Design a binder for this molecule. Structure first.
Ligand SMILES: *[C@@H]1O[C@@H](CO)[C@@H](O[C@@H]2O[C@H](CO)[C@@H](O)[C@H](O)[C@H]2NC(C)=O)[C@H](O)[C@H]1NC(C)=O
Ligand SMILES: *[C@@H]1O[C@H](CO)[C@@H](O[C@@H]2O[C@H](CO)[C@@H](O)[C@H](O)[C@H]2NC(C)=O)[C@H](O)[C@H]1NC(C)=O
Ligand SMILES: *[C@@H]1O[C@H](CO)[C@@H](O)[C@H](O)[C@H]1NC(C)=O
Length: 863
């Protein structure tokens, strides 16, 4: 055996020969570091029994275990393989127990397949029988994508494992972790997945969410594929340099999907087609968000709001953390420290801003006739709590307010209880959106206030390498009971069900509106309901750096609205770090400055009315706001087609192997390259400039660089921002709120490619109504430049903004002097616009023009 292909047979202890012999595995301690000493033999596991059966959907096979005494509990002697050719580019197979039903994820979006195998498959599937393996190859070039033959299938009641060889080491995805780089380290790495409230630090632990999807770029042609495991039990994923990946889970079934595409963006599109495309955000949620844990009093909160408004900082959203509550209890506010909370909210609204309030899932069980607590009383009447293993007594744990019970959001009546809590509280405080936190679910005691019984659920045969080494650590007992099943099976689904329920609440509380939900814990599919933030980071330069792969991975996962706490939640932030982070932070899809309890202020205005940090912050936030129409259109494409929003360079530049591991730079969509300074003391950044024409965003000048590493000069007040030739970017003059900015004139920036062509598009709707896309109430136009001519072409025209918006400026980059500019409307001329030309920079600006939004125009020039 090649040592890189050994599949570790002793994942559960230090390897020894005795155990190896006992398990019937192979023993060879003569390998390199991390190479498994004890590994599976060539004939371990299952074989196909008899013949495969053609079905309407694909085929089934019966798999029979070649006998062996129990290692990690009761083995499954007869396995059923069911394979479904669901679409031309999506294959589904599951391995179940022939004789017994087992837990299967009750996903809100994925449905079972009915009817017949798709025609025109891009993939071919091959089963081997002695021993069992499954292989998926790309039909066009015979590339083997999925091939399980490298290792055994293991299928015990609490230990399920399958491995696959990979065509390349360009592997991206899995979560939620701090990987520290974007392209996977394939050198014997294990990543546990089990939702858990822990710090996103350098330790490589399981964090708040569970994401099994990864994407593999097969080669420079762009051909790519993805694999998703629909399984919500604690699990770990093991990467090795064969290259290969192994999924090892402690329950449920092995339910896999394989996705093929011609490009990385196509794989993401196929994945999101299956699990659910992300929600289209409220346009205001794309503005800047400010927050902290423990303003302490409303006066303090209002003081921060007011200095940042007086600074003229673009600033749409204020979040209120648990300090607003009465003794950290949901659905109350502190009538002394937060006295006047409703008036303050009116003041936010009057200034065009929005209030987002935190809501935790755990509910104080401290209620008496003397001092009742309505949410507990109402929830108990509805009997909607998670129960102890007895099935009938609500489980008791401890969170912010003290002893608490936990809502069972898998119960349909829990969403009705939850909705009523919000409608009641909203009548007192008119919040605009909801931040759901501690929803792993996070418990300050292990399991419950009485601990956990010793049983195969709380103390399973195998425990993946999760933080602290026990499943119920800082969460619920694994034998706790909910409508969807036992905690052991549904733990990873708690935050997911909470988001579904919260989205359900929003149908009543904000009728017909998208509102905004931000969640900590996620499962596959969570992006359909909620934004995500990367959690309780730290004010260090490492955390700044680690944020970029985190944002990119969540964009693969269909949660494009994701960002960390800008400036760092834990710790006082240094001015230089916070300045650099604010600069980068202006370009995260979710942009929120958030700070932990007790640390020095890190709101931009706190650094000084005339400070460099505040000037640079306002500068780059104004750029962000100017580009909101482009960012919003990217979100429209995520929502409607499944595209990423913050995008790895490799998704556009995959033909260039220099981009395959780039993670200190990223794109907005196809067209905008962001190059932050990420090193302490630095005024330069080593950056890659891909193989395109690029223009400096601010000056419009063409950089000399192309397809090369450069040291980009970036002084204290600068971040690198470059526009890609070939693309047209719609813009709107900024203001300090999106409420106000949406009323301003629009602009186009045309970045010409080598052929003096460019293309772009603009989506426009009312920015807040839910399902404007499904119900087709929007504007979509296309811009295309092909020498001497700009065409504005309208493809969907069912929204007309009543604010009478128009493009009143067109900036053309990389152009020779335009002359004799004409404007035709519906092909009818026409008014002669002003043109300014900078011959040194090759930039033309067309002004004194008024192209109505939603109308077709031709603009033409000579040279
Ligand atoms: C950005 O914001 C708005 C409102 O916040 C707007 O202010 C208004 O502008 C009008 C002057 O042209 C006034 O008639 C009106 O009283 C004023 N309201 C205020 C200050 O509360 C700004 O004009 C707008 N500016 C930009 C650049 O779009
Ligand atoms: C948790 O325990 C409660 C009892 O405290 C269960 O409540 C039941 O709720 C249903 C639906 O309203 C009623 O029809 C039952 O009669 C209730 N039982 C009792 C004993 O009062 C609830 O079902 C439990 N939840 C789970 C998931 O087991
Ligand atoms: C890992 O966690 C420990 C606490 O167990 C912490 O002190 C340490 O700094 C973390 N390591 C890294 C590399 O961030």
């Amino acid at each position: 055996v090649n040592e890189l292909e050994r599949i570790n047979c002793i994942p559960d202890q230090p390897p020894t020969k005795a155990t190896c012999d006992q398990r019937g595995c192979c023993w060879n301690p003569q390998g390199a570091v991390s190479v498994p000493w004890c590994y599976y033999s060539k004939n371990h596991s299952y074989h196909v029994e008899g013949n495969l059966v053609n079905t309407n959907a694909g085929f089934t096979a019966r798999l029979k275990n070649l006998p062996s005494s129990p290692v990690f509990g009761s083995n499954v002697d007869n396995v059923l393989l069911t394979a479904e050719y669901q679409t031309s580019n999506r294959f589904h197979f599951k391995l179940t127990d022939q004789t017994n039903n087992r837990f299967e994820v009750p996903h809100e979006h994925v449905q079972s397949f009915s009817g017949n195998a798709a025609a025109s498959l891009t993939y071919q599937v091959e089963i081997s029988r002695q021993p069992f393996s499954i292989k998926v190859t790309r039909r066009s070039n015979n590339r083997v994508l999925f091939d399980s033959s490298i290792g055994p299938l293991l299928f015990a009641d609490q230990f399920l494992q399958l491995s696959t060889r990979l065509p390349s080491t360009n592997v991206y995805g899995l979560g939620e972790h701090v990987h520290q780089q974007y392209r996977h380290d394939m050198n014997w790495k294990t990543w546990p997945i089990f939702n858990r409230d822990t710090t996103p630090n350098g330790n490589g632990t399981n964090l708040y969410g569970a994401q099994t999807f990864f994407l593999c770029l097969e080669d420079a042609s762009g051909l790519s594929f993805g694999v998703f495991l629909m399984n919500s039990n604690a699990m770990e994923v093991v990467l090795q340099p064969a290259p290969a990946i192994t999924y090892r889970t402690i329950g449920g079934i092995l339910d896999f999907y394989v996705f093929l595409g011609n490009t990385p963006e196509q794989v993401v599109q196929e994945y999101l087609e299956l699990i659910g495309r992300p929600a289209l955000p409220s346009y205001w949620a794309l503005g800047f968000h400010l927050s902290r844990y423990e303003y302490g009093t409303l006066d303090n909160m209002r003081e921060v709001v007011e200095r940042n408004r007086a600074a003229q900082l673009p600033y749409d959203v204020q979040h209120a953390d648990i300090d607003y509550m009465d003794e950290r209890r949901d659905f109350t506010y502190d009538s002394v420290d937060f006295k006047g909370f409703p008036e303050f909210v009116n003041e936010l609204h009057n200034n065009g801003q929005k209030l987002v309030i935190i809501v935790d899932p755990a509910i104080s069980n401290n209620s008496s006739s003397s001092k009742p607590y309505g949410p507990y009383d109402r929830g108990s009447d509805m009997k909607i709590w998670v129960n102890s293993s007895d099935g009938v007594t609500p489980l008791i744990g401890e969170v912010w307010p003290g002893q608490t019970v936990f809502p069972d959001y898998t119960n349909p009546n829990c969403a009705v209880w939850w909705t009523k809590e919000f409608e009641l509280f909203h009548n007192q405080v008119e919040f605009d959106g909801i931040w759901i936190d501690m929803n792993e679910v996070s418990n300050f005691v292990d399991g419950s206030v009485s601990g956990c019984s010793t049983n195969n659920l709380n103390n399973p045969p195998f425990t993946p390498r999760i933080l602290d080494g026990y499943l119920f650590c800082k969460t619920l007992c694994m034998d706790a009971v909910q409508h969807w099943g036992k905690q052991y099976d549904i733990h990873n689904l708690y935050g997911y069900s909470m988001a579904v329920a919260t989205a359900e609440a929003a149908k009543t509380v904000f009728p017909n509106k998208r509102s905004f939900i931000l969640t900590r814990s996620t499962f596959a599919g969570s992006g359909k309901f909620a934004a995500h933030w990367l959690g309780d980071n730290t004010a260090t330069w490492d955390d700044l750096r680690w944020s970029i792969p985190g944002v990119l991975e969540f964009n693969l996962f269909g949660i494009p609205m994701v960002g960390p706490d800008i400036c760092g939640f834990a710790l006082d932030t240094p001015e230089e770090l916070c300045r650099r982070w604010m600069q980068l932070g202006a370009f995260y899809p979710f942009s929120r400055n958030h700070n932990g309890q007790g640390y020095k202020d890190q709101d931009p205005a706190s650094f000084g009315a005339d400070s460099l940090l505040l000037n640079s912050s306002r500068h780059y936030l104004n750029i962000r706001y100017t580009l909101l129409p482009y960012l919003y259109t990217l979100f429209f494409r995520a929502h409607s087609r499944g595209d990423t929003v913050a995008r790895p360079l490799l998704h556009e530049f995959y033909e260039d192997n220099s981009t395959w591991d780039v993670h200190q730079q990223f794109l907005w969509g196809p067209g905008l390259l962001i190059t932050p300074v990420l090193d302490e003391g630095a005024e330069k950044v080593m950056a890659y400039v891909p193989d395109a024409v690029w223009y400096d965003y601010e000056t419009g000048s063409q950089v000399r660089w192309r397809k090369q590493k450069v040291e980009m000069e970036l002084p204290g007040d600068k971040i690198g921002l470059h526009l890609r030739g070939g693309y047209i970017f719609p813009t709107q003059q900024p203001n300090t709120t999106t409420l106000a900015s949406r009323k301003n004139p629009l602009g186009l920036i045309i970045a010409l490619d080598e052929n003096k062509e460019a293309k772009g598009e603009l989506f426009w709707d009312d920015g807040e109504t839910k399902d404007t896309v499904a119900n087709k109430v929007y504007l979509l136009c296309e811009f295309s430049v092909t020498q001497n001519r700009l065409e504005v072409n309208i493809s969907q025209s069912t929204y007309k903004d009543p604010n009478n918006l128009a493009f009143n400026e067109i900036k053309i980059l990389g152009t020779e002097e335009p002359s004799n500019v004409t404007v035709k409307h519906n092909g009818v001329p026409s008014t002669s616009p002003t043109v300014t030309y900078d011959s040194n920079l090759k930039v033309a600006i067309i002004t004194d023009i008024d192209l109505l939004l939603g109308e077709a125009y031709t603009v033409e020039w000579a040279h």
